[PDB]
Amino acid sequence: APRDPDADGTEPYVLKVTQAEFDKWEVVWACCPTGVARRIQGVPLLI
Amino acid sequence: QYSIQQSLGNASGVAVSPINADATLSTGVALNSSLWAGIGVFARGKPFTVLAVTESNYEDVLGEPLKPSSGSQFEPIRHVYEAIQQTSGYVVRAVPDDAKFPIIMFDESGEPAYSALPYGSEIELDSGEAFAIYVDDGDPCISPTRELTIETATADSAGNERFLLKLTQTTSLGVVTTLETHTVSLAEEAKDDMGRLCYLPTALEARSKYLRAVVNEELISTAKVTNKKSLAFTGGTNGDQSKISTAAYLRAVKVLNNAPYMYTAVLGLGCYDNAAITALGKICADRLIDGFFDVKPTLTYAEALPAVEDTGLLGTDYVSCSVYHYPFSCKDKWTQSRVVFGLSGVAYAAKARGVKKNSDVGGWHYSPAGEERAVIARASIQPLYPEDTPDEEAMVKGRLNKVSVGTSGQMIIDDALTCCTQDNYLHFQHVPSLMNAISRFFVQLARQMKHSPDGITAAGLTKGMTKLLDRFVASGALVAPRDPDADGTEPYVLKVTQAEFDKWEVVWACCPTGVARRIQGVPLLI
Amino acid sequence: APRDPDADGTEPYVLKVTQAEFDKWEVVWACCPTGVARRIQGVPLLI
Amino acid sequence: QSRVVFGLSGVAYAAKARGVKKNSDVGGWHYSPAGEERAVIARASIQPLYPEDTPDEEAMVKGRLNKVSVGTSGQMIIDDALTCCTQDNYLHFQHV
């Protein structure tokens, strides 16, 4: 799911087809790649 | 394993930040410990130094009690004895200029010589004298006399010759006891059996209470010590302690001012010098420390009132200071004879008894004048001025605390008032103690919170002050305001104002409890 | 938050972008730094 | 093992590093390099060279000098942090 749910929909991918020109034809797809855990940081807190 | 880094960079390795804890911060203050400090004239002690005396070892530090035959010298030791029954304390000894201490000088061959020098002056070594040894304690070697013996010893690897010094005490009858034994070497680089450094000045300054030594640097290389037995210190005398100049008292007060140790109360141990009392009151006001003072008992009832005005304490500048008068006489425990005391220390005893009633808060509520807190236990009391009565109203106007006869035939302090001219709830001693305790705790807690970002320090100060005020309310220090229409039911009201960018203000308002001094009852018929 | 809420908004920072010149371009940011506790003063009051 | 005189440089940097390390991502530049725990000046033993003499605090503030004092636990501590700025326009502080 996108990291910005307010500006972007919850759908992981969004696809649209536009006929546009009579013989030409366009397709657009948008995807949100997953995250890669490269750096991990942890802090201790006392309560 | 391997090291764990902190504050990792831009790639790869992981890190753990240092442990962060701030809501757990707290300040540890006893707030119940009570200690007394004072100055006086004592038979034995180190002049112009702060000495700590406890219930057990006070007699050894202050020496034998002074004889009542001598004038104005038995008062300080007996006042200290009366005041020390509850808690330990700190004393400063004042000495006249005529007093001196003995010194033993050793030549290159080893022939001893004796001399005496005043306390203030520093010793000087002439040509031909290898070193000198003097007594740091300052006790004159009269009556019980102190003697020094020297014995040879073996070397240690490097061949540095060492020797044993033994200090012993002999009574008048002939009883001999071993006080101190030490191993010292003239060589700068010397070692003991356990590895301790063996240098006479260093060793004496490190692990000795009686002797100090000064070695001339010219004759350190060529110096030999032979066997000498029973070397006795020459005559050292103490000057007339009845007459003490005001300058000595001022110097003693100044020395007492700069003391790293903390004391809760200041007591006047039989001091009747006006300048000294004013200085002590200034110290009490500066340190926000309660103080007790005593007018000279020799004055009569009529002359007591002008004496208080003579001392520079009748004003609004000194609030916590209190004064007492006691013209009666009793009998000394040590010597069966008549004596006149000053009512100082008994008030401190009452304050300590009132404080001990609570464990954590401190129990500063009770005034130092009560049915059971103050009893004045003495062998027998004979009034000096019979057929004469004091004026109660005059004493109240002059801020003097009187004494009366209790139900069980025991003399008792029936009032507690401070040296405050105005009647703005400050003449009572109950309120300044609480206010001083609160101020001291606030200063101690705020000292830790210095140089903190805004918001965090606000939360810390608010939490700490609220906890302290809640503890005091639970202990019964604060009561609901006497005017509920104009003032809220909350015993305390606290507010924090940031105001200036770097400055920051805190305000707290409290309602002290009431003290039952006068009770009136009327009968009515229905 | 600013020490003057009547004259300044409650926002800790205010940022604005002005195109101005055709090729030049300006950005302005305003911030309110936190306070440092250097002097603390307290008074006792009796009620 | 001998007596030496140092210059108070690096200890301030140590305090700044300690203040920075309090935060991971942002940086933690909030804290001034003069605090109860940030600056401690740990040394074997300190002997003052000019006893019976006291400095003037107001003169140092006017001259933009940072002094030292004795902490609660008997440790010498830096009790102020100021920069070389003549004006009082919130810039003499090192925090901003």
Q: Which two tokens stand for residue B148?
A: 């020094």
Beta bridge partners of B185: B162
Judged by a CB distance cut-off of 8 A, whether residue D81 touches chain B is yes
Q: Say whether A19 sits in a helix, a strand or coil.
A: coil
Residues B108, B109, B115, B119: is their CA dihedral positive or negative? positive
- Amino acid letter, residue A1: A
**Residue B304: how many CB atoms within 10 A of its CB?**
22
Judged by a CB distance cut-off of 8 A, whether residue D94 touches chain C is no
> From CA D50, how far away is CA B68, in angstroms rounded?
48
For B133, residues 6+ apart whose C-beta sits below 8 A from its C-beta are: B103, B104, B105, B106, B148, B211, B212, B213
Q: Which of C34, C38, C45, C47 best probes binding to B when mutated, by most B CB atoms within 10 angstroms?
A: C47
Contact B312, B281 (CB under 8 A): yes
> From CA B168, how far away is CA B147, in angstroms rounded?
5
Are B450 and C37 in contact (CB < 8 Å)?
yes
Residue of B271, B249, B386, B259 whose CA lies nearest to B329: B386
Q: What are phi and psi of B319, to 5 degrees?
A: -105, -45
> From CA B349, how far away is CA B441, in angstroms rounded?
24
Contact B323, B293 (CB under 8 A): yes
Are B501 and C3 in contact (CB < 8 Å)?
yes
Q: Any idea which residue has 């608010």 for tokens?
A: B462
Residue of B370, B326, B330, B336 whose CA lies nearest to B352: B370
Question: CA Rg, chain C, in Å?
Answer: 19
Q: In a 10 Å sphere around its CB, with 0-12 CB exposed, 13-18 middle and 19+ buried, how is residue B154 labelled?
A: exposed
Nearest to A46 among B16, B17, B24 (CB): B24
> From CA B237, how far away is CA B17, in angstroms rounded?
69
Contact B75, B85 (CB under 8 A): no
Tell me the helix, strand and coil percentages in chain D, rounded to 5.
20, 5, 75
Are B508 and C46 in contact (CB < 8 Å)?
no
**Residue D13: how many CB atoms within 10 A of its CB?**
10
Give the DSSP H/E element, type plus range, for residue B167: strand B162-170
> From CA B198, how far away is CA B187, in angstroms rounded?
8
DSSP assignment string, B344-413: -SHHHHHHHHHHTT-SSS----S-S--TTT-----S--B-SSTT----HHHHHHHT-B-EEE-TTS-EEE
What does DSSP assign to residue B513? P
| Subunit partners of chain C (3 or more CB pairs within 8 A) | B, D
Q: Which two tokens stand for residue B442?
A: 């606030």
Are A43 and D24 in contact (CB < 8 Å)?
yes
Measured at the alpha carbon of residue B475, what is the angle toward residues B474 and B477, in degrees to the nearest 5? 100
Give the DSSP H/E element, type plus range, for residue B450: none
Judged by a CB distance cut-off of 8 A, whether residue B6 touches chain D is yes
Residue of B185, B178, B189 whose CA lies nearest to B148: B178
Judged by a CB distance cut-off of 8 A, whether residue D30 touches chain C is yes
Q: Which residues from chain A sit within 8 angstroms of residue B26, using beta carbons?
A: none
DSSP assignment string, A1-47: --S-TTTS-S-SEEEEEE--SSS--EEEEEE-PPP-----EE--B--
Quickly list H helices, B449-500: 456-475
| Subunit partners of chain D (3 or more CB pairs within 8 A) | A, B, C
Spell B71-95 as b/e; 16+ CB within 10 A means b.
eebbbbbbbbbbbbebbbbbbbbbb
Q: Say whether B116 sits in a helix, a strand or coil.
A: strand
Contact B402, B357 (CB under 8 A): no
Q: Say whether B458 sits in a helix, a strand or coil.
A: helix
Tell me the helix, strand and coil percentages in chain C, rounded to 5.
0, 45, 55
Question: CA Rg, chain A, in Å?
Answer: 19
Q: Which two tokens stand for residue A39?
A: 């750096």
Q: Any idea which residue has 């100021």 for tokens?
A: D82
Q: Any idea which residue has 């180190």 for tokens?
A: B46
Chains B and A touch (3+ CB pairs under 8 A): yes
Judged by a CB distance cut-off of 8 A, whether residue C43 touches chain B is yes
Q: Are strands B503-510 and B492-497 parallel, antiparallel or unpaired?
A: antiparallel
Are C38 and B457 in contact (CB < 8 Å)?
no
Minimum distance, in Å, between the CA of residue C45 and any CA atom of chain D: 28
> From CA B100, how far away is CA B96, in angstroms rounded?
9
Contact B42, B77 (CB under 8 A): yes
Contact B390, B305 (CB under 8 A): no
